[PDB]
Design a binder for this molecule. Structure first.
Ligand SMILES: Cc1ncc(COP(=O)(O)O)c(/C=N/[C@@H](CCC(=O)O)C(=O)O)c1O
Ligand SMILES: Cc1ncc(COP(=O)(O)O)c(/C=N/[C@@H](CCC(=O)O)C(=O)O)c1O
Lengths: 512, 512
């Protein structure tokens, strides 16, 4: 019971899962902890900052560049001055997007400090677009009301009273204006997929499915409707239920009617090309086409969240390009910081970009000179040698996926599936809530199975894995492109060992 | 008409203000741009990352520490593992808070990536506290309804029908549950001061007064009520109008009555000890005591935003400690990154801290090992030599404030006031909307006066100043504690020159 100032509950919980270790040094695909006698134990890292480390921990080329930037007296804090590196970074991302999609679309860049901040720039810009559509619609309704009033107060037309259930000339117009103003102040909706993960700030948390992470915060901010990814059939009806109307007066020269017209409620659709919070499921072509339909139908942007799938993880720079997802806005973060600094970017198609956003949105630390320099280095590295790095991710991914499939095939009793693409892979664990072993069953029931299995992998095979998915029902594999054949073989051995113990329901070996 | 990929509108606007320059290098209180012939021109920086650079640009001690951390193979990405530096940082902040306030309160630390993200951790934890208060209140109401039902369906008591205007035993209870459920799902309120700046993300932007930055985003997220700082008289009534009731049945053995009870609407009160968005006005004792009364009365936390006032800027570590503001939660960011990295912290009093927050809140980049190491270095630097660094800030502050007051006294026709404390100072500019010069008048009317005057100071005196406040009506002075007497004299000369031109209404010299 000594004084503790952070992390007591987090550390207590990690210790009971068998993950209570302090990593003291890291290089490439290895993190080191200290044993009882103070010796470094190498651990293979398959978590890698939840896919931040495409080039591994502390890549010598990123470390050298960071030290050169610091020694050159880089201007980190140059707010409200010319920072051409921001334009230079956006130009490269623009060229890469054009090459990978064959589309000649141009994107404005706004920078931020995290994946959530980049997603929230997109939520804000989407709401600027919706307020533009609202202004246009309300201006038209004013004109339609003036024309209907001209016709009713001067002979021409008679107000049909069959339509009054939707609400005397002047009083009907007051009732319409009251109805419309209420509608206009209502919060918008966001559309996301089931299992969506888009961050955990006040805005972004509402876009994140995981119920214990989100539901306490429901009242703070605009909600999302979580569309069922597996059944595109059902999305149509869910979105149709969210339809809302404003009222106007329609003149048919003879008769004036109160009529409903459509109100823009949906600010944006968000999609991850490979769904982190769903256990690394790739968006199917059928779901891609439903998101395209929704975007074309509602006139709101489709925001492609590549915070995790970007910077080569899937075997292309953009996962969306690989899977044929045609977004209006794109977000990047994780790997762009080179595994050492914090940086993110929102790319917004220039034909939709509202110039006000460049001067009403800002952040102290955004576009800092240090992370700008490191971004340019990361982009040079991932693009080097005519795109060989993408090729390496693809062949390392194939080797790791083949190993995971080979393991699943011999352990189908405890492993249901392999998901993901390139170096963003996961094993789906079969439910263990009815497990013979009480200790395993108890942990599975509390949603901790993945964490317990991760602990086994650490203490018995010196491999760092973290679970994914809503009840730690998936094991994530997202190492660097430098993962060796030998490290893949040691992972295979570790998994056969883990899944043999799980088949045998050896609770004393698995749960501490 | 060439392709541009970032910052076209930002750069166009900075050029027209006379602030179109690229800083290529920075050291201490100097940023350098390149002249036509490629020579470095020294500019004195009074903006310093909006008060991020208490130790100046690229302090050798922070640069050396950052390079040592990178060369040691510091684990930047160690998510869901033991990271003791987080507890070590919180321990130091805890010890400093105790020393400066004489209170023996303990604080839990949650880390993030920006000042806004730290403020949003506080908004989220404040909403967890409100959901706890709501659960308790609704549990009591259930018990009160059961006891009232027992008494009405068995002789004891008669339902008084004088109270029914607030809504048959079973039907009155259904109407109460419907009323209460509607109330429970309503968005909360935040309380802030007029001129408040708390960040610009989906949640935090609602807490920021500046109307063009906020009003486009009104529909997204819980609003703030902006309390008038200068007239505490009026705060009582504004908060009293926001009172909301839930219903219950109160048994007085004899009679059962429908009665209103208080519902917790206000999630949190936010305050800056020195109000950045108000032109650096310090919170008065009278306003401090009104915020204390509101906090004690509503039972919500008082969140002290020290993103700008913290890490020694005001002549103490905590500005709140200096001005007697007794917060429940505190936020820090800017200077804690050493002017090179991105880091922030929310300190939440342990007697209020809800353990769920440690495991339902997270961020990829939060608590990274590199910014953790740099935080410890910054804390060691600001605390060194038994607090002499705070003494230095106070005597540099006095010297700079005295100079600004000396300038005001001879230029009261264009300068209305000096605001702030320690090294967080501003000049208030008198309104120039009636200026003789058309060019000046036009710029003042558009809210750009401060920016224009900043441009004069850059091109004619090689001094970087940025405006503050809602219509660039204040000039910010927030240099490093290394600001020399000579740099203060050059600033005095530059300001006499600027304010002499403004008195003379020399529009051709001031506006390009
Ligand atoms: C697809 C996607 N979108 C947004 C985010 C939020 O990025 P951050 O705010 O930098 O953590 C992320 C971060 N993802 C990690 C974050 C885990 C955590 O919150 O610590 C994960 O899924 O495990 C993301 O993956
Ligand atoms: C008192 C206070 N609270 C929160 C913030 C937001 O922190 P960040 O998200 O890191 O920009 C800040 C940032 N302040 C600067 C930054 C301006 C900007 O670039 O957005 C200012 O007042 O001008 C702050 O001062």
């Amino acid at each position: 019971g000594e004084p503790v100032y952070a992390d007591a509950v987090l550390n207590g919980w990690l210790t009971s899962m068998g993950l209570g270790v302090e990593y003291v040094r890291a290089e490439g695909n290895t993190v080191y902890y200290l044993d009882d006698e103070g010796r470094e134990v190498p651990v293979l890292d398959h978590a890698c900052g939840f896919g931040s480390l495409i080039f591994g921990h502390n890549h010598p080329e990123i470390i050298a560049h960071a030290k050169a930037a610091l020694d050159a007296g880089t201007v980190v804090h140059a707010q409200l001055s010319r920072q051409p590196r921001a334009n230079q970074i956006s130009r490269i991302l623009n060229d890469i997007m054009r090459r990978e999609t064959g589309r000649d679309d141009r994107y404005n860049a706004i920078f931020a400090n995290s994946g959530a901040e980049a997603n929230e720039i997109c939520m804000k810009h989407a709401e600027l677009e919706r307020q533009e559509r609202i202004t246009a619609l309300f201006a038209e309704i004013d004109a339609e009301l003036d024309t209907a009033r001209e016709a009713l107060t001067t002979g021409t037309a008679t107000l049909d009273t069959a339509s009054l259930p939707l609400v005397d000339v002047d009083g009907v117009i007051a009732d319409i204006h009251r109805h419309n103003d209420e509608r206009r102040a209502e919060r918008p909706l966001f559309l996301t997929l089931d299992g969506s993960f888009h961050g955990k700030l006040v805005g972004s948390i509402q876009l994140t499915q995981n119920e214990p992470w989100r539901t306490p915060f429901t009242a703070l901010s605009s909600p999302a409707r979580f569309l069922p990814a597996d059944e595109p059939e059902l999305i149509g009806k869910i979105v149709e239920d969210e339809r809302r109307s404003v009222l106007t007066l329609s003149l048919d020269k003879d008769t004036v009617r109160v009529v409903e017209r459509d109100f823009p409620v949906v600010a944006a659709i968000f999609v991850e090309p490979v769904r982190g919070g769903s256990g690394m499921k790739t968006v199917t072509p059928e779901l891609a086409e439903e998101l395209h339909r929704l975007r074309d139908t509602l006139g709101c942007p489709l925001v492609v969240d590549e915070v995790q799938t970007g910077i080569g993880r899937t075997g292309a720079f953009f996962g969306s390009a690989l899977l044929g997802i045609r977004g209006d806005y794109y977000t990047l973060a994780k790997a762009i910081g080179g595994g050492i600094v914090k940086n993110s970017v929102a790319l917004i198609r220039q034909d939709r970009f509202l110039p006000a956003m460049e001067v009403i949105h800002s952040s102290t630390f955004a576009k800092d000179g240090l992370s700008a320099s490191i971004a340019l280095k990361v982009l040079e590295m991932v693009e080097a040698d005519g795109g060989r790095v993408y090729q390496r991710v693809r062949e390392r991914g194939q080797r790791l996926e083949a190993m995971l499939e080979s393991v699943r095939a011999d352990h189908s009793d405890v492993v249901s599936a392999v998901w993901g693409t390139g170096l963003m892979l996961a094993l789906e664990l079969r439910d263990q809530s009815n497990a013979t072993s009480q200790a395993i069953r108890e942990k599975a029931a509390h949603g901790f199975l993945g964490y317990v299995l991760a602990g086994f992998l650490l203490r018995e095979h010196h491999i760092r894995v973290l679970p994914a998915g809503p009840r730690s029902g998936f094991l994530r594999f997202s190492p660097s492109l430098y993962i060796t054949d030998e490290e893949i073989d040691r992972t295979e051995t570790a998994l056969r060992s883990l899944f043999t113990a799980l088949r045998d329901q050896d609770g004393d070996r698995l749960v501490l």
